[PDB]
């Protein structure tokens, strides 16, 4: 879905690179680890910069794993992560990039929004929507919906996947609900509000059937009950919103289906507070009343979610891409400055060590 | 005095061997969830913790899944959420992960504390990092989570003296000629009663010795 | 003698004979034996009623105040004695135990009424 200019790797290919044989750097780090000493972030940077084959991808994965489990794990630089993803894309190794991203705890791969978009768009161009969905779920887990381009791409992929899905496991419901709620909150349009409603409906179903811990545990979600109430609040907000904002009929149908299905371990809640299973009938009545109110106000959209998201993508992704490319160029310049400072520090330390050794 | 040099030699060797064979957090604070015992020492955890140990997460079990180990993020605790209605949390400023951990789920952390809505001036080390009691505040919820309106905290400024001590104070006053009728009072405004679950000084806390 | 850490505490040292207890209120290092070395004797406590039906407690209030002002701790029985004397507030557990005994006697009275 992204332009060739956004996906172009020429400027990254033109980065100033100091050439090494990957075997030499690997042996140096092996000696360092054997001596139980810390490895510099510059060394791992040089190894990742000097991947020249698909087997060097396999070796660099192992050395990333070893660096993550070392005293200087925190110092893995952003340009190194970007280069790792670029190399994986270059040598037809998207599966390895996805593997490291999924096991980010073991490898320390925490991409920026540009790098997420690169990976997700590669998967989308190859029509591998399953892996694109995996990348979207990783973006959700990392809470990286701060850039509009990522939000739009994630919404597109999510609605594409939901358009052809019937069987829902509660983990799948939880992941889909979170991944649609987070970008839906940052988009103040009809698509964003419909995504908010759909995700709140899914999370409320998960909460009522499996419990609130199933919702918030190891998720970027809050531990407060009342997700269905928040969906109804989204409907209420749309009712008092300007003319242009609307709600897709599909999201309303999903919420209605969830309520119709719901109305047919440690206790974390105070016994004086009313449970959700007891407020289901009132939620249903509120849903029917608000649905009639929205239908009267003409705040219901008949277009499907996927088509509406496609149209929004076509309208906004170009300007989002322009902004992202500008920020990416700024980042590359700053990274070059930082890398040259690191190289100078190493050279100065080595020369001072030689000066001392000469005595 | 005949010198005792073997004692000094043994003390120095023991100090060196303790500083070189230090047990790591991944070893000290590992837990067998089936039996709820520490494999390092074999001691069983207290009963009141068992459920939490099987449901909640350690702090770096959360921080290892975040960029920069979650610097600047807000982390709260389940016990604080249950006990207190006002927001209690840490704003992280520095993290030292235990690289020897297989999942990088052990380590140390520093941050700025807000307890019951009162933020501290400086950042200090976080205690109970190894407890299974930690939750991560979502970015889109922070504004709602952090919101707090300071209620008027007007408490007693003075209390009566105990009966016999009051009687003795008054008797001494009348002995020294004073005839004023004001009741003796104990000022209690400078005695601030700190909640028992307020975070303590982790820098002053000890560490389990290797064995 | 040098103890590792420790502090001064005002407590009750037990003397007397079998089935005839008597207490000396003393300020001593907490690590010392109960009836062993002490820093100062601050009073006495006879828990057996005398011929006048009285439990006699002697308290050196000046020296007790001095040692509290020098950093000495208090054992729970000593805090309860000082609360009974009116020198301290009544300890929370005297109040709680009194309430518990009131409830128990109320239950007994209710049992008698039910019978």
């Amino acid at each position: 879905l992204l332009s060739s200019a956004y996906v172009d790797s020429h400027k990254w290919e033109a980065r100033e690179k100091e050439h090494y044989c990957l075997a030499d750097l690997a042996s140096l780090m092996d000696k360092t680890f054997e001596r139980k000493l810390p490895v510099s972030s510059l060394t791992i940077s040089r190894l990742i910069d000097n991947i020249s084959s698909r087997e060097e991808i396999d070796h660099a994965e192992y050395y990333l794993y070893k660096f993550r489990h070392s005293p200087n794990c925190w110092y893995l630089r952003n340009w190194t992560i970007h280069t790792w993803i670029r190399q994986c894309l270059k040598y037809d190794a998207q599966d390895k990039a996805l593997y490291t991203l999924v096991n980010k705890v073991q490898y320390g791969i925490f991409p920026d929004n540009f790098t997420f978009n690169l990976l997700m768009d590669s998967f989308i161009k190859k029509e591998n929507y399953k892996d694109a969905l995996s990348v979207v779920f990783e973006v959700m887990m990392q809470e990286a919906f701060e850039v509009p381009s990522t939000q739009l791409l994630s919404l597109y992929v999510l609605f594409h996947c939901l358009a052809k899905k019937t069987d829902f496991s509660w983990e799948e419901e939880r992941n889909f609900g979170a991944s649609l709620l987070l970008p839906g909150l940052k988009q103040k349009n009809s698509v964003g509000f419909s995504s908010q409603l759909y995700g709140y409906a899914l999370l409320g179903k998960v909460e009522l059937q499996q419990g609130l811990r199933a919702v918030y545990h190891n998720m970027p979600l809050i531990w407060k009950p009342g997700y269905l109430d928040r969906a109804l609040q989204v409907m209420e907000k749309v009712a008092a919103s300007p003319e242009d904002i609307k709600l897709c009929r599909e999201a309303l149908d999903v919420l209605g289906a969830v309520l119709k299905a719901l109305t047919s371990k440690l206790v974390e809640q105070l016994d004086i507070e009313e449970t959700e299973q007891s407020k289901l009938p009132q939620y249903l009545e509120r849903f029917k009343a608000l649905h009639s109110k929205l239908q009267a106000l003409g705040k219901i959209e008949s277009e499907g979610l996927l088509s509406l998201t496609t149209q929004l993508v076509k309208e906004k992704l170009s300007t989002c891409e322009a902004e992202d490319i500008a920020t990416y160029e700024q980042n590359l310049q700053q990274w070059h400055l930082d890398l040259v400072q690191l190289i100078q520090r190493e050279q100065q330390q080595r020369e001072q060590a030689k000066q001392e050794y000469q005595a | 005095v005949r010198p005792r040099l073997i004692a000094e030699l043994a003390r120095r060797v023991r100090a060196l061997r303790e500083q070189l064979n230090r047990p790591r957090d991944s070893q000290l604070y590992a837990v067998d969830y089936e039996t709820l015992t520490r494999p390092f020492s074999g001691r069983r955890l207290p009963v009141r913790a068992w459920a939490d140990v099987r449901r909640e997460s350690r702090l770096l079990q959360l921080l290892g899944r975040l960029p920069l180990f979650g610097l600047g993020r807000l982390v709260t605790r389940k016990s604080w959420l249950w006990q207190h209605d006002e927001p209690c949390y840490w704003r992280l400023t520095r993290v030292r992960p235990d690289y020897t951990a297989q999942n990088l789920d052990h380590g140390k952390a520093w941050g700025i504390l807000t307890f019951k809505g009162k933020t501290e001036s400086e950042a200090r080390e976080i205690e109970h990092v190894m407890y299974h009691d930690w939750r991560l505040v979502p970015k889109h919820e922070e504004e709602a989570f952090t919101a707090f309106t300071p209620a008027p905290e007007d408490s007693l400024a003075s209390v009566p003296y105990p009966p016999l001590l009051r009687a003795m104070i008054i008797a001494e006053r009348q002995k020294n000629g004073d005839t004023s009728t004001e009741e003796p009072m104990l000022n209690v405004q400078r005695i601030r009663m700190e909640p028992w679950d307020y975070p303590a000084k982790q820098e002053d806390k000890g560490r389990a010795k290797g064995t | 003698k040098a103890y590792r850490g420790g502090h001064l505490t005002i407590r009750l040292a037990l003397g007397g004979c079998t089935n005839r207890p008597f207490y000396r209120i003393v300020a001593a290092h907490n690590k010392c034996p109960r009836d062993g070395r002490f820093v100062e004797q601050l009073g006495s406590y006879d828990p057996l009623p005398n011929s006048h039906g009285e439990k006699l407690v002697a308290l050196n209030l000046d020296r007790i105040r001095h040692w509290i002002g020098c950093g000495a701790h208090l054992s729970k029985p000593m805090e309860k004695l000082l609360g009974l004397a009116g020198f301290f507030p009544l300890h929370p557990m005297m109040i709680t135990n009194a309430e518990r005994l009131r409830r128990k006697r109320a239950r007994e009275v209710l049992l008698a009424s039910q019978k």
Partner: peptide, 30 residues
């Protein structure tokens, strides 16, 4: 105590609770 605090304690000590005690008798029962 307020009912909210009693419920908070009832949550804190699930499964390890005694019968709640009311106000004690005003005087010592005879």
């Amino acid at each position: 105590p307020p009912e909210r605090e009693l419920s908070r304690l009832r949550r804190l000590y699930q499964g390890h609770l005694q019968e709640e005690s009311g106000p004690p008798p005003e005087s010592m029962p005879k």
